[PDB]
């Protein structure tokens, strides 16, 4: 093969294919843990029908994942969302590349 090699160049194009991920320590824990999140046992990134209460930004993204990503990228979210400044958001950010459809 000869096309662009994501594992080296940085071009990632398959992100939207994840349903959820669960973490567990020592066979009986849960690192998010402690009734922190709406769905405390694991993170939910997209949903089918009934999760029509928990979606944000006119798409199929659960609120909590939006919150987590906003925080961990730009420490914004405990004071209401808005557009982070140009300097603090470089090319490989999370908010340069968001697209709802």
């Amino acid at each position: 093969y000869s096309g662009s090699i994501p594992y080296l160049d940085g071009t990632f194009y398959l992100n939207h294919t994840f349903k959820k991920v669960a973490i567990t320590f020592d066979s009986s824990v849960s690192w998010p843990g402690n009734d922190r999140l709406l769905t405390p046992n694991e993170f939910e990134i997209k949903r089918s029908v009934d999760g029509e209460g928990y979606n944000v930004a006119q798409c199929n993204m659960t609120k909590d994942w939006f919150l987590v990503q906003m925080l961990a990228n730009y420490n914004i979210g405990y004071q209401g969302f808005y557009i982070p400044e140009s300097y603090k958001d470089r090319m490989y950010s999370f908010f340069r590349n968001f697209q709802p459809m």
Partner: protein, 50 residues
């Protein structure tokens, strides 16, 4: 800072509140809420939207 910021006892990050009264008229509807902030918390209003 290792300590004295985050708690350790189970407390939720996001809260969702149901209306307790909805009334309807052909050109406007009125919705009421009983917001509740317990002790040992501070809520900044910038993060409340309908």
């Amino acid at each position: 800072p290792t300590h004295d910021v985050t708690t350790d006892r189970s407390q939720r990050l996001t809260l969702r509140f149901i209306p307790v009264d909805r009334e309807d008229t052909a050109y406007s509807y009125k919705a009421r809420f009983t917001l509740a902030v317990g002790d040992n918390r501070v809520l900044d209003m910038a993060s409340t939207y309908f």
